[PDB]
Structure formats: structure tokens, C-alpha cells
């Protein structure tokens, strides 16, 4: 059953007649992560490449 509207705001809706839609949402976050980079140093066609 997917009928779990996310916090259906019900913010003073004034209208006549209605629609049957279900509300879902997207959630964006930013995080600081530790990642290890590899430095390739082949002399051919430039050498330094991280």
C-alpha cells in the first residue's frame, strides 16, 4: 500500500472539487567523505595526473 503522503501539509487549501494524487519527495544531502586518490605518473603525453 503506497498511500503514505509525506506530511500532506494541508496548508489552508481552499478549492471546489479534487484530484486523487499521492505526494512523494526527493531528499538532497551533502556529506564530507574520506576518499583515497591514485596519482598516475606515466611519462607519455603528460605525466602528472591525480
Amino acid at each position: 500500500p503506497t498511500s503514505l503522503d509525506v506530511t500532506s501539509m494541508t496548508s489552508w487549501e481552499y478549492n471546489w472539487f479534487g484530484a486523487d494524487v499521492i505526494y512523494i519527495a526527493k531528499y538532497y544531502e551533502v556529506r564530507k567523505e574520506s576518499v583515497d586518490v591514485i596519482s598516475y605518473r606515466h611519462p607519455i603525453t603528460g605525466e602528472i595526473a591525480t
Binding site: 487549501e13 478549492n15 484530484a19 494524487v21
Partner: protein, 50 residues
């Protein structure tokens, strides 16, 4: 693609419903008031000639 090509005068998306407007919808009330005023003046004027 679907071979149907829609054309709109003015279109907006207010509350989950596509709402359109042309160039006549805004002026029906003054016109249908003017008609009533003209008729109600005409019959009253024709009522009493002299």
C-alpha cells in the same frame, strides 16, 4: 512521440491542475451587466411616453 500538438493562450499550473485562459473570460461580468442595464432602461423608458 504522440502526434498531438497542444496550443494554449495562457497556461499555468496552480494546484495539480492545468489552468488555461484566453481573452474573453475576464470580461463576461461587465458585459452581462451592461446588457441587463440596457434592457431595464429600455423597458422603463418605453413604459411611460408622456
Amino acid at each position: 512521440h504522440i502526434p498531438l500538438i497542444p496550443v494554449y493562450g495562457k497556461r499555468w499550473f496552480i494546484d495539480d491542475i492545468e489552468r488555461v485562459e484566453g481573452h474573453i473570460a475576464k470580461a463576461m461580468d461587465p458585459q452581462r451587466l451592461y446588457n441587463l442595464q440596457v434592457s431595464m432602461l429600455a423597458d422603463t423608458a418605453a413604459q411611460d411616453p408622456g
